[PDB]
Every structure is written in C-alpha cells, then in structure tokens.
Design a protein around this ligand. Structure first.
Ligand SMILES: Nc1ncnc2c1ncn2[C@@H]1O[C@H](COP(=O)(O)OP(=O)(O)O)[C@@H](O)[C@H]1O
Length: 243
C-alpha cells in the first residue's frame, strides 16, 4: 500500500530531511526515488478524510517578488474573483493577489489554517469551503465530519497536541518557510483515527543559520508563515467541540 507524488525538488529534498528529523512520525513514510510515499488511507475501512491547508499566508514570499516583475494573469482565477463577488480591480476587470483574496474570504488570515476539502465513507467528496471563515463555521464542518464520534475527536486532539510538541523542537521545521502543506485528518467507522503533515511542494530553507518563529505576523522579509498560529487555533476549535 503506497502512492507516487510527481517528484518536484523542494519536496524530494523536504522528504530526504524529514525522514531524518524528529518529525518523521508526523509525515508519510518516504520510500526513496524508485516519489514513493506511504498511503495514509491503507489502514482504514471506509476512510473519512479532511484536508486542512495550514498557514497565515499561502504563497512563497519569493513568488511575490518574482511576481513584482513578470505577470502570472491566468483568466480562470479572475473568473474565480468575480463569480464570487465584485471585489476585482477595473484593471483586472479589463485585462498571489488571488491567493491573498482567497485567504481573507477563507479562514487562512484570521486563524492560520483553512479547510480545503473532505471525503466521506461514501458521501463522495466536497471542496466547497471557500467562504468557511469563522470559528463557528469551522467547528460546524468538523462537527459534521465526525458525526458525533467522541473517540475519534479524542484521538485527533491527542495527535494534534503531540504534533504541536514535535513541531516546536524540530530543527528542520525551524529552518524553513513551509507554505502550502496540509494537516490531513483520517478516520473510519471503527473509531480509528490519524493526522499527518503532507505537501512539501512549497517549504524552503531560510538564510545562513536563520530561524523562523512560525507564530508572529508576516512582513516583506519575515518569511514568517504563521503555521503554529494556525495549529494553536485548530486545536482550540477541536477542544471546544469536545463539549
Ligand atoms: N501519502 C498520502 N496518502 C494518502 N493520500 C494522500 C497522500 N498524500 C496526498 N494524499 C491526497 O492527495 C491530496 C493532495 O496531496 P498534496 O500533497 O496536497 O498535493 P498537491 O500539492 O498537488 O496539492 C490530499 O489532500 C490527499 O487527499
């Protein structure tokens, strides 16, 4: 039971180091370049899955610089910033920003994480959470996803606390930008449950010896991502649901 990504570099490398970091248990086991990863669904019966995009900012600060010169005008995304609302400029109307617009209507800006999608035992799938922003709304999606199973919620919380601790002493995590990865929640009707970090497509190293705090606000040079601020809240939201 395995899975093959489509190997990119910041990820292969992100993987060649995680299998050597204290975070090894918090991510899919990596199995060389024969990308050969562990299938996190293999141990469940009818897998229920929820992918949480963790972070205050969802684009590499570097993608913003490189974007300051060359334009990336995709007309599809602007079909996106319109059919949702008129917030779009007269310049856009007639011709990163999308992502940072997505962060505000979403939950990434007010609590560093955002629900990307869900898969059920057989309720198929949904990615319709673009405006899920408030804490009450986040809980509602989680509350439904769990279906009253308190044993699953207990296990998800215990794992989040354990992940949080590992992240705080991880030197790898410490020396990196990490943007666009997710916390993938998985559980089944057998009460089985697990949580892992995935997506190391973005995630880059900082200057010689420089480190990130992962909780303070981002400013042009910070390269800060607010990842732990997102985890602090996600845990907060699940601990209250536990009542
Ligand atoms: N190791 C894995 N085991 C099982 N399912 C996975 C695994 N990695 C990814 N998935 C599934 O693939 C989706 C996208 O993976 P991700 O790394 O985020 O790809 P991309 O970077 O193209 O978005 C996840 O939300 C999840 O449903």
């Amino acid at each position: 039971g395995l899975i093959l990504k489509r190997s990119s570099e910041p990820e292969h490398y992100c993987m060649v180091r995680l299998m050597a970091d204290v975070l090894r248990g918090c991510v899919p086991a990596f199995h060389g370049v024969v990308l050969q990863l562990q299938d996190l669904l293999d141990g469940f019966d009818g897998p229920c899955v929820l992918d949480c995009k963790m972070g205050v900012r969802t684009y590499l600060e570097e993608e913003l610089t490189k974007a300051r010169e060359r334009p990336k005008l995709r007309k599809d995304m602007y079909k996106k910033m319109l059919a949702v609302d008129p917030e779009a400029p007269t310049e856009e109307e007639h011709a990163p920003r999308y992502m940072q617009w997505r962060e505000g209507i979403s939950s990434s800006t007010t609590l560093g994480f955002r629900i990307e999608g869900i898969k059920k035992a057989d309720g198929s799938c949904s990615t319709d959470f673009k405006t899920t922003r408030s804490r009450e709304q986040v809980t509602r999606v989680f509350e439904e996803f769990m279906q009253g199973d308190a044993e699953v919620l207990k296990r998800y919380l215990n794992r989040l606390q354990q992940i949080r601790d590992t992240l705080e002493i991880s030197d790898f995590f410490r020396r990196h930008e990490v943007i666009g990865s997710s916390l993938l929640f998985v559980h089944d009707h057998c009460h089985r449950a697990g949580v892992w970090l995935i997506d190391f497509g973005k995630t880059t190293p900082l200057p010689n010896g420089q480190i990130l705090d992962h909780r303070r606000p981002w400013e042009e040079g910070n390269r800060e991502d607010g990842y732990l601020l997102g985890l602090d809240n996600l845990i907060g939201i699940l601990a209250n649901l536990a009542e």
